[PDB]
Each structure stands twice: as C-alpha cells, then as structure tokens.
Write a protein that binds this ligand. Structure first.
Ligand code: A1BQE
Ligand code: ZN
Length: 139
C-alpha cells in the first residue's frame, strides 16, 4: 500500500484503489496501473520533473529504503494476475531490488522529488510506475 499526495490529488496503484478513490476519480489508466482521485486536504509531495535514473525507494516488506539505478519509462510485459490479464504496462521503470506484492505504493524519490510508485516485481527486480510526465498534478 501507499499513495502520493500532491495538491488536491491522491495518486495510487489502480489495482489497489478504494471505493472513495473511484467515487472521486480524476483520471485512471489500466495500462499504467495508475489512478488519481481528488482530496479535500492539500498535499505537500513534490513531483520530480527530470530524467534521473538513480534514486531511493521504500520497501515495506523489509521496513527499509534502498538506493537503485532504474531504467527509462517503457512498455514492459507483466504476467497475468487477479487484477489484470497478461499485457504490456507502459511508463514502467525497472531496477534490481527486493519487492513483494504488498510493496506496491512505496514511493521512489530522487533529489528532485517523487518519481513514481512500486507497481510490479519478481525475480530480484522491482518495477515503478512513473508519474514525472503528469504535469497537471501541479496546476
Ligand atoms: C511489487 S509487486 C510484486 C512483487 C513481487 C512479486 Br513475486 C509479485 C508482485 C505482484 C505483481 O507484480 N503484480 C500483481 C499486482 C498487479 C501488478 C501490475 N502492475 O500489473 C503485477
Ligand atoms: Zn530527478
């Protein structure tokens, strides 16, 4: 679990969105596993606007932050699950690192701010859904 709070928005993994998230929906994309809902209170997370490939992510299954090198956002195959059929998830970035299904939502940050959230994993790898291109989260 985990969310990004920026302005009047809440950013979560689409496969983990609540009833409240869907009743206050702003935008959603199954192909990115992202969902954005509106909030009453203000959010103080800063989104990075950069092409950084290094950063730190929170891993809840270890209660630890890990530094990582990560790939550029791209279309990557993701095996079927209870939430989606087997497909290409777009805007996905991979790193060598530990993750388990309950790790989705952990924030990945660089020196510029929030880069994205844990969305995939398996075989000593961790996948992050990028949010750096969502320029509207600030305006
Ligand atoms: C950090 S998630 C994870 C980590 C290790 C292992 Br084994 C398995 C997982 C689970 C996982 O990758 N998915 C299930 C939830 C939907 C995800 C998606 N974005 O399509 C795919
Ligand atoms: Zn950066």
């Amino acid at each position: 679990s985990g969310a990004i709070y920026v302005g009047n928005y809440r950013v979560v993994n689409r496969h983990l969105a609540t009833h409240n998230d869907w009743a206050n929906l702003v935008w959603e994309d199954s192909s990115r596993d992202l969902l954005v809902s509106s909030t009453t209170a203000q959010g103080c997370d800063t989104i990075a606007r950069c092409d950084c490939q290094t950063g730190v992510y929170y891993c809840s299954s270890r209660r630890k932050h890990y530094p990582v090198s990560f790939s550029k956002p791209s279309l990557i195959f993701v095996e079927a699950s209870e939430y989606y059929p087997a497909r290409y998830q777009s805007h996905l970035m991979l790193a060598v690192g530990h993750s388990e299904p309950g790790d989705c939502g952990g924030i990945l940050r660089c020196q510029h701010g929030v880069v994205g959230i844990v969305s995939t994993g398996g075989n000593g790898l961790v996948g992050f859904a990028d949010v750096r291109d969502l320029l509207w989260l600030d305006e």
